[PDB]
Amino acid sequence: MTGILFSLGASMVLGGVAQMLAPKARTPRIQTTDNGKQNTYFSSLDNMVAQGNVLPVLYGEMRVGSRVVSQEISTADEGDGGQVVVIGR
Template sequence: MATIRFYGDLKQYGTKFKLNAETAAEALNGLYLQIKGLRQNIMNGYFRVRINGQDMTEDSLKFGMHTKLADDAVIHLVPQVAGAKGGIFTTILGAALVVVGAFTSWTGVSTALIYIGAAMMAGGLSSMLTKLPSVDMKNDNQGKQNTSFSSLDNTIAQGAPVPLCYGTMKIGSKVLSQGLETI
């Protein structure tokens, strides 16, 4: 009897399943057949697999999924944390400021150095864990750049956001819809 436990985004399908299966691959295939959308979600994600307390690497996963399971085997599927891998310098500099602040505790700036260092470490870690979206400066308006603020031709492509202005503003127009009617 194998127990499969889901974590993170996979919890939408359930948290714990018990199946009578010989291998981990057989157990997952049994769940794929019963739960709609599970296979696609696992294929699109990046997961850490742990079988009987042993983490599977990419090399050992090929053989680990097809080896015979123990009677009380537990298979964990945990989403793997991935990020943009930036901000390492900010994290290291923040840690250095925390250390300097701790060693200069007799001065008045030590608490400020510790707080600034902790904030820099948190910012560096968050930038490492967050993937930044790419910004496309061109819109879909016949290959022209967005001319909202730089030209008399004040047009925008379909699907682009429409700005909301509150208060008294002096702005140019943005044509939302234009039509031609003949009688």
């Protein structure tokens, strides 16, 4: 039930007036593999691996590239779904 009480104004303002009214947004770290391509934390346009990674969340209209769950190559069936199928010329 004792102590000394200090003034926080000079300590709070030390960063900037803006951070007192609203936090600051984060910027991804820079990698030189991109040849200067700049990234952001809320967009991804390429297909990523699946295991060990989180399932993303999309909040608005945007172009998306999504984690791959399956991928295969096989020979295609000749029938197109109709009763009549014609092979060759």
